[PDB]
């Protein structure tokens, strides 16, 4: 039993180059990315109204939905499904944390939009989170529904429609509430996870709940154990139940495919669906987009 | 242009 | 007697940079959106399933 | 051997200690977005002018809300050394924007606002009409031509005002106030024809697009030059017209046979289309 000295000399070893790693990126942050989005001049409360006075492109827009409200940025879809689609949630490469407190995911964070090859506007989207402010403010302008797709590593695709869809104000802690189910990726929102049955089936259901961070613990898992909660460090802002049946604000694993001793508290934390891909799979896109309904 |  | 304990410990640390491997994979990945350029890196998580395993192969 | 294992387990256990904490520091430092270097000004106003009065300096993208608008609008103002600012209401200087756009287009405005003033674009004609006419004070148009040689020209047309969309915001001055690249809304004596620059001056026409024909054609002009504008039958001075890379070209490059370019007929030939059009209005007592 000698070759266990080959064990910890090869970690070690591991452990030199992660040093390493660590710091050069560390040193790559001493500068920002930069982006210069030129901002298009049609304008209008959201991305439906926006389609509707002729901005046929997707791409960043700015929009104003209340007079109240000071103008902000926001990726504007205008091909999917008729367009008009005002993207609230975005993930495809990792390149933003979505493990964030309780303030950044009410403020909303990440890159609403980058530049293409040269154009001098930006028409990709980055990843972000609108913020809960600004969610819930636009589903109550009136009845609003939200198309989510996602797509797996093996390049398949799939997605779940709801006609309604609703986020009460911070004071309500941002209640969520979905009906109206429609595609391919399984209801996991109001049916919770297809694989369980009974009570820890209900239980993974998240029409209904309220939002929760790792630093503000409002889970539908009542109790009073502190490295017990939905969400964890890392872990991203949801509106968990006890606790999950989907996660779009998840860890981005790559690959997909990715087991509990690779989860920092060896829970499944990633971007997931499981009423599609189950439960350790974590996808290479996600995203949430929202429009008022007709 | 003029158009005749 | 001296690696009867001393092996169970090996065997927590290759959790431990197992995790700590891809917690720092994905943490140096969400730099992407943030600072100018991004380490290219690879985490070869197949090495550390070979030790882990093997490690198997000596405490039976 | 036998404790040889013992130090070397205990520390590299320290190393992944101290290493988690400098993840730490990289977590909190990646957790800002891109920097993106165009932002919007604070001072706002009824226009560009009012906002240069409020002690603005710099030119650059600012929100305005002219009396009668019921939401304020995103603009790029330019603001001089003398207090002057210029709201612009148009802008071509590479044809990276595509200027055949529908009614609703060319009515709510479409390309893109640059803090550098670097992109062509088409404020809504919504909106240069609630600014040209928000109160009685006259306002003033000026248009700036470059061609491909580095060589520019103005003209100037005092008492501008674009009407509401029920009179299809036609275009209306009082008289041409001067500038070396010609009165074209006054129309061109092309040729022959004697009621040649008759058909082809501007002031007082309609707006038109292949969507929305009002003008004095029997067919479309707007359609057929591939844009929108306030076409007679149809122009001398077409500034959103298709933009032709070096400025020459022929109506074999078209393919309805119309001279379409960007063209301004009392500085340059219609069959030569300008590098850089630039239309912008401000308080005529401004200029006086
Ligand atoms: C409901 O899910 C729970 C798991 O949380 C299952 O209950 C026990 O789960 C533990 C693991 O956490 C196992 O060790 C036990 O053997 C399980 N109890 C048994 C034998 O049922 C439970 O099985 C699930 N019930 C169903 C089928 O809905
Ligand atoms: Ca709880
Ligand atoms: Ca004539
Ligand atoms: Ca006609």
Same mark, same amino acid.
């Given at each position: 039993?000698?070759?266990?000295?080959?064990?910890?000399?090869?970690?070690?070893?591991?452990?030199?180059?992660?040093?390493?790693?660590?710091?050069?990126?560390?040193?790559?942050?001493?500068?920002?990315?930069?982006?210069?989005?030129?901002?298009?001049?049609?304008?209008?409360?959201? =991305?439906?109204?926006?389609?509707?006075?002729?901005?046929?492109?997707?791409?960043?827009?700015?929009?104003?939905?209340?007079?109240?409200?000071?103008?902000?940025?926001?990726?504007? !879809?205008?091909?999917?499904?008729?367009?008009?689609?005002?993207?609230?949630?975005?993930?495809? !490469?990792?390149?933003?944390?979505?493990?964030?407190?309780?303030?950044?995911?009410?403020?909303?964070?990440?890159?609403?939009?980058?530049?293409? !090859?040269?154009?001098?506007?930006?028409?990709?989207?980055?990843?972000?989170?609108?913020?809960? !402010?600004?969610?819930?403010?636009?589903?109550?302008?009136?009845?609003?529904?939200?198309?989510?797709?996602?797509?797996?590593?093996?390049?398949?695709?799939?997605?779940? @429609?709801?006609?309604?869809?609703?986020?009460?104000?911070?004071?309500?802690?941002?209640?969520?509430?979905?009906?109206?189910?429609?595609?391919?990726?399984?209801?996991?929102?109001?049916?919770?996870?297809?694989?369980?049955?009974?009570?820890?089936?209900?239980?993974?259901? @998240?029409?209904?709940?309220?939002?929760?961070?790792?630093?503000?613990?409002?889970?539908?898992?009542?109790?009073?154990?502190?490295?017990?909660? =939905?969400?964890?460090?890392?872990?991203?802002?949801?509106?968990?139940?006890? =606790?999950?049946?989907?996660?779009?604000?998840?860890?981005?694993?790559?690959?997909?495919?990715?087991?509990?001793?690779?989860?920092? @508290?060896?829970?499944?934390?990633?971007?997931?669906?499981?009423?599609?891909?189950?439960?350790?799979?974590?996808?290479?896109?996600?995203?949430?987009?929202?429009?008022?309904?007709? | 242009?003029?158009?005749? | 007697?001296?690696?009867?304990?001393?092996?169970?410990?090996? *065997?927590?640390? $290759?959790?431990?940079?197992? *995790?700590?491997?891809?917690?720092? %994979?994905?943490?140096?990945?969400?730099?992407?959106?943030?600072?100018? *350029?991004?380490?290219?890196?690879?985490? %070869? $998580?197949?090495?550390?399933? %070979?030790?882990?395993?093997? $490690?198997?192969?000596?405490?039976? | 051997?036998?404790?040889?294992?013992?130090?070397?387990?205990?520390?590299?256990?320290?190393?992944?200690?101290?290493?988690? /904490?400098?993840?730490?520091?990289?977590?909190?430092?990646?957790?800002?977005?891109?920097?993106?270097?165009?932002?919007?000004?604070?001072?706002?106003?009824?226009?560009?002018?009012?906002?240069?009065?409020?002690?603005?300096?710099?030119?650059?993208?600012?929100?305005?809300?002219?009396?009668?608008?019921?939401?304020?609008?995103?603009?790029?103002?330019?603001?001089?050394?003398?207090?002057?600012?210029?709201?612009?209401?148009?802008?071509?200087?590479?044809?990276?924007?595509?200027?055949?756009?529908?009614?609703?287009?060319?009515?709510? +405005?479409?390309?893109?606002?640059?803090?550098? &003033?670097?992109?062509?674009?088409?404020? &809504?004609? /919504?909106?240069?009409?609630?600014?040209?006419?928000?109160?009685?004070?006259?306002?003033?148009?000026?248009?700036?031509?470059?061609?491909?040689?580095?060589?520019?020209?103005?003209?100037?047309?005092?008492?501008?005002?674009?009407?509401?969309?029920?009179?299809?915001?036609?275009?209306?001055?009082?008289?041409?106030?001067?500038?070396?690249? &010609?009165?074209?809304?006054?129309?061109?004596?092309?040729?022959?024809?004697?009621?040649?620059?008759?058909? #082809?001056?501007?002031?007082?026409?309609?707006?038109? #697009?292949?969507?929305?024909?009002?003008?004095?054609?029997?067919?479309?002009?707007? /359609?057929?030059?591939?844009? +929108?504008?306030?076409?007679?039958?149809?122009?001398?001075?077409?500034?959103?017209?298709?933009?032709?890379?070096? +400025?020459?070209?022929?109506?074999?490059?078209?393919?309805?046979?119309?001279?379409?370019?960007?063209?301004?007929? #009392?500085?340059?030939?219609?069959?030569?289309?300008?590098?850089?059009?630039?239309?912008?209005?401000?308080?005529?007592?401004?200029?006086?």
């Amino acid at each position: 039993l000698r070759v266990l000295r080959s064990i910890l000399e090869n970690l070690r070893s591991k452990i030199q180059k992660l040093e390493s790693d660590v710091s050069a990126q560390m040193e790559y942050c001493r500068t920002p990315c930069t982006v210069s989005c030129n901002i298009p001049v049609v304008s209008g409360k959201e =991305c439906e109204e926006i389609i509707r006075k002729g901005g046929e492109t997707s791409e960043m827009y700015l929009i104003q939905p209340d007079s109240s409200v000071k103008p902000y940025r926001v990726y504007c !879809d205008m091909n999917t499904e008729n367009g008009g689609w005002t993207v609230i949630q975005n993930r495809q !490469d990792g390149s933003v944390d979505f493990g964030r407190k309780w303030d950044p995911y009410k403020q909303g964070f990440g890159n609403v939009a980058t530049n293409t !090859d040269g154009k001098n506007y930006c028409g990709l989207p980055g990843e972000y989170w609108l913020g809960n !402010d600004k969610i819930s403010q636009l589903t109550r302008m009136g009845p609003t529904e939200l198309l989510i797709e996602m797509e797996d590593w093996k390049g398949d695709k799939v997605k779940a @429609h709801y006609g309604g869809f609703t986020v009460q104000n911070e004071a309500n802690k941002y209640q969520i509430s979905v009906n109206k189910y429609r595609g391919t990726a399984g209801n996991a929102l109001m049916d919770g996870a297809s694989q369980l049955m009974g009570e820890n089936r209900t239980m993974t259901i @998240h029409n209904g709940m309220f939002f929760s961070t790792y630093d503000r613990d409002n889970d539908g898992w009542l109790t009073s154990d502190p490295r017990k909660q =939905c969400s964890k460090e890392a872990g991203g802002g949801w509106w968990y139940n006890r =606790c999950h049946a989907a996660n779009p604000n998840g860890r981005y694993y790559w690959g997909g495919q990715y087991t509990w001793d690779m989860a920092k @508290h060896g829970t499944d934390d990633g971007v997931v669906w499981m009423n599609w891909k189950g439960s350790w799979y974590s996808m290479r896109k996600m995203s949430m987009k929202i429009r008022p309904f007709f | 242009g003029h158009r005749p | 007697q001296h690696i009867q304990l001393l092996q169970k410990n090996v *065997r927590a640390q $290759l959790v431990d940079m197992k *995790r700590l491997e891809v917690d720092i %994979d994905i943490k140096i990945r969400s730099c992407r959106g943030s600072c100018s *350029r991004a380490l290219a890196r690879e985490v %070869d $998580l197949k090495d550390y399933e %070979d030790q882990q395993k093997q $490690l198997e192969q000596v405490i039976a | 051997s036998i404790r040889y294992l013992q130090e070397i387990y205990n520390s590299n256990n320290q190393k992944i200690v101290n290493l988690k /904490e400098k993840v730490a520091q990289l977590e909190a430092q990646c957790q800002e977005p891109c920097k993106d270097t165009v932002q919007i000004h604070d001072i706002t106003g009824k226009d560009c002018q009012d906002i240069a009065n409020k002690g603005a300096k710099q030119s650059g993208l600012y929100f305005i809300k002219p009396l009668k608008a019921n939401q304020q609008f995103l603009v790029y103002c330019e603001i001089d050394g003398s207090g002057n600012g210029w709201t612009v209401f148009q802008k071509r200087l590479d044809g990276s924007v595509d200027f055949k756009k529908n009614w609703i287009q060319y009515k709510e +405005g479409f390309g893109h606002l640059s803090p550098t &003033g670097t992109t062509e674009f088409w404020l &809504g004609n /919504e909106k240069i009409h609630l600014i040209s006419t928000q109160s009685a004070i006259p306002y003033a148009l000026r248009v700036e031509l470059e061609d491909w040689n580095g060589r520019t020209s103005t003209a100037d047309y005092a008492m501008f005002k674009v009407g509401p969309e029920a009179d299809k915001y036609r275009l209306t001055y009082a008289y041409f106030a001067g500038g070396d690249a &010609g009165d074209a809304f006054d129309g061109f004596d092309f040729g022959d024809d004697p009621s040649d620059k008759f058909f #082809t001056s501007h002031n007082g026409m309609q707006f038109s #697009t292949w969507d929305n024909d009002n003008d004095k054609f029997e067919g479309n002009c707007a /359609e057929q030059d591939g844009s +929108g504008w306030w076409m007679n039958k149809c122009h001398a001075g077409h500034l959103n017209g298709v933009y032709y890379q070096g +400025g020459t070209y022929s109506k074999a490059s078209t393919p309805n046979g119309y001279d379409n370019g960007i063209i301004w007929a #009392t500085w340059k030939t219609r069959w030569y289309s300008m590098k850089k059009t630039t239309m912008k209005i401000i308080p005529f007592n401004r200029l006086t």
